[PDB]
Amino acid sequence: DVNYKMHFRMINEQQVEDITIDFFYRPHTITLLSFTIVSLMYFAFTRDDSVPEDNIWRGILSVIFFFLIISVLAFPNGPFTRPHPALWRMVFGLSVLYFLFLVFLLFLNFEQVKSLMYWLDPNLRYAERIISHFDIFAFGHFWGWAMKALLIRSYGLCWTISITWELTELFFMHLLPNFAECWWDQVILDILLCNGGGIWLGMVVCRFLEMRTYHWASFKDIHTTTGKIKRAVLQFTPASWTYVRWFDPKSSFQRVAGVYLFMIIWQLTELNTFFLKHIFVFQASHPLSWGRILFIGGITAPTVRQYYAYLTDTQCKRVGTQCWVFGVIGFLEAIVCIKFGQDLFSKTQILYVVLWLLCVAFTTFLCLYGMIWYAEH
């Protein structure tokens, strides 16, 4: 049990190894205690609070900001400790904020949630060819897969969900009347280039990042300025890379069904994005659209490394807190879509979702066979 509680602190609160500059890792909470009071003193005595509309906004911004300060002192930093552990306590701080925001939304009705969205943005109330298709969103979609494949470390897992989702969005665009997106948009442009190009780049880096000899000289020791610039910049890159093996030839029925649940919660988070944008009508350029995608993308990096650790390591015996929070967020967003999306379906079929369930297991079982046989040949 000494290992069973120590192995959780390698998942939940990964510690910094080989600290040389100790100014960056010594707490100053009393100075943080003195900063918050003087910060709020300036805002409680000099800010003009004569308008009620801008008082609620700045109060919300301050609650979010000062919850990030509390998260630095009290929240776990995941299995990541670069560039600083505190930047991952502040990402876990936003996960809890977004989790509790969804808990609130389940208890409202559609007229209150729509009135809430219009408060955030009043403009929401009133609302060759292939080359032009590539926009700033296609760049984000390419780098989303180049980051997912960086952590999943599998062609079979990433192409299984790249293909199934694009097939689903092609099918789910039967309801959407106005868009004229032809099938090649999400079967040739997306599956091949935006996804496969992203998947290829992400899996190419994993080979590089995991075969690299991680030798980290201290910043003070380097004498040449170009080395100091190299060392300063290299702080924002991983200090080590885990060797990921989702499947084993002797993998049990528990492990095989732990990668099956992994690729259902993965695809659940893609139905959340599709329906939240459709139930609450906002354009893809709105910060509610790509601001949420960036935040969920930031959460995913420590969640994939904590679900993998729990699933495989036999001395873990607890699932990391960030993976727990990414579990409620992904499940609650579906309940939000079912509750408020009671109207945009009349006779629509869940059978495709049921059919998607089988075609995922069909591809995990084929993945195990293609790797069990791989040892033989």
Ligand X SMILES: CCCCCCCCCCCCCC
Ligand Y SMILES: CCCCCC(=O)OC[C@H](COP(=O)(O)OC[C@H](N)C(=O)O)OC(=O)CCCCC
Ligand Z SMILES: CCCCC/C=C/C/C=C/C/C=C\C/C=C\CCCC(=O)O[C@H](COC(=O)CCCCCCCCCCCCCCCCC)COP(=O)(O)O[C@@H]1[C@H](O)[C@H](O)[C@@H](O)[C@H](O)[C@H]1O
Q: Which positions touch ligand CCCCCCCCCCCC (CB under 6 A)?
A: 136, 285
Decide if residue 27 touches ligand LBN (CB under 6 A).
yes
- Give me the least distance between CB of 141 and Ca ion, in Å please: 7
CA distances, 248 to each of 24, 110, 138, 155, 258 (Å)? 41, 47, 35, 16, 13
According to CB under 8 A, which one of 3, 20, 66, 229 is a site residue for its own copies?
A: 66
The only residue of 172, 200, 260, 295 in contact with ligand X, by rule CB under 6 A: 295
Please report, as residue ranges, which positions from 75 to 94 form the binding site for ligand X (by CB under 6 A).
Answer: 91
Does 299 contact its own copies by CB under 8 A? no
Amino acid at 72: V
Among 294, 344, 353, 357, binds ligand X (CB under 6 A): 294
Site for ligand Y in 82-121 (CB under 6 A): 82-84
Find out whether 68 and 93 touch, Cβ atoms under 8 Å.
yes
The rounded distance, in Å, linking the Cα atoms of 279 and 276 is: 5
From candidates 30, 74, 211, 358, binder to ligand LBN by CB under 6 A: 30
* Binding partner of residue 352 among ligand LBN, Ca ion, ligand X, none, CB cut-off 5 to 8 Å per kind: none
Euclidean distance between CA atoms 103 and 268, whole angstroms: 18
Direct distance between the N- and C-terminal alpha carbons of the chain, in angstroms, rounded to an integer: 41
Q: Does 234 bind ligand Z (CB under 6 A)?
A: no
Long-range interactions of 94-97: CB distance < 8 A, separation 24+: 94/64, 94/68, 94/295, 95/299, 95/322, 95/325, 95/326, 95/329, 96/67, 96/71, 96/325, 97/64, 97/67
What separation in angstroms does the CA of 260 have from each of 158, 215, 276, 363? 13, 36, 24, 10
For residue 300, the number of C-alpha atoms closer than 13 Å in the C-beta half-sphere is 21
Is residue 265 within 8 Å of 319, Cβ to Cβ? no
266 binds ligand LBN (CB under 6 A): yes
Task: Report the residue number, 249 or 291, with the smaller CB distance to ligand CCCCCCCCCCCC.
Answer: 291
Q: Which does 370 bind (CB under 5 to 8 A by kind): ligand X, ligand CCCCCCCCCCCC, ligand Y, none?
A: none
Would you say 87 or 244 has its CB closer to ligand X? 87
Place of tokens 């999306």: 341
- Closest CA relative to residue 194, chosen from 151, 156, 149, 152: 149
Tokens standing for 294? 């960036």
From candidates 298, 310, 312, 341, binder to ligand X by CB under 6 A: 298
Is 12 or 168 the residue whose CB approaches Ca ion more closely?
A: 168
Alpha carbon distance 369, 358 (integer Å): 17
- Do the beta carbons of residue 145 and residue 158 sit within 8 Å? yes
Whichever of 109 and 348 has its CB closer to its own copies, that residue is: 109
Stretch touching ligand Y by CB under 6 A, among 12-20, 194-202, 279-287, 320-328: 12-20
**Helices (DSSP H) in the chain: which residue ranges?**
2-9, 29-45, 52-74, 86-105, 110-120, 123-126, 129-133, 136-152, 155-172, 183-184, 197-210, 225-234, 253-279, 287-312, 321-340, 351-376
Question: Shortest distance, CB of residue 290 to ligand LBN, whole angstroms?
Answer: 4
| Least distance (Å) between residue 168 CB and Ca ion | 9
Which residue of the chain is nearest ligand X when measured via CB?
A: 298
Indicate which single residue of 6, 28, 135, 192 sits in contact with ligand Z (rule: CB under 6 A): 28
- CB of 24 or CB of 119, closer to ligand Z: 24
Q: Which of Ca ion, ligand X, its own copies, none does residue 74 bind (CB under 5 to 8 Å by kind)?
A: its own copies
Is 215 among the residues that bind ligand Z (CB under 6 A)? no
Phi then psi dihedrals of residue 76, to 5 deg: -70, 150
Q: CA quadruple 363, 369, 374, 375: dihedral positive or negative? A: positive
Q: State the DSSP code for 342.
A: S
User: What are the residues binding its own copies (CB under 8 A)?
Assistant: 27, 29-30, 32-33, 36-37, 40-41, 43-45, 47, 49-50, 52, 55-56, 58-60, 62-63, 66-67, 70, 73-76, 92, 96, 99-100, 103-109, 111-112, 318-319, 321, 324-325, 327-328, 331-332, 335-336, 338-339
> Under the rule (CB under 6 A), what is the footprint of ligand Y?
16-21, 24, 79-84, 147, 150, 216, 218-219, 232, 235-242, 301, 305
